[PDB]
Structures are given as C-alpha cells and as structure tokens.
C-alpha cells in the first residue's frame, strides 16, 4: 500500500506520500523523515484513510 504522512508542527505542516508497503515499514520510514526534519513526537495512525500523523 501507499501511505500518507501528515507532519504537523515546528518545522513544517504538510502531507507526504511515501510508497511504504505495510504499516510496520511505514513507522520506521516515518520516524526517520520526521526526525530528519525536526518533528519528533507522538505518533497516530488510522488504517481506513491510509493516514499517519506525527503530532506534537
């Protein structure tokens, strides 16, 4: 599957589409992108919308 990351705060607000395949892998990819850009913090995910949020 393809998963959407919403990054919300600090450095940037926006949505980046990563061809992340599965849930597990997308957490490891998304922790990296988040920490790469600054917004290390709390994680939420919703399945039905293919949606991951890095929230303050």
Curated annotation (Swiss-Prot):
Which cell locations does it reside in?
Secreted, Cell wall
Start and end residues of the sequence repeats are 2-56
Q: Which domain of life is it from?
A: Bacteria
Reported function: Binds to the constant Fc region of IgG with high affinity.
Q: What is this protein called?
A: Immunoglobulin G-binding protein G
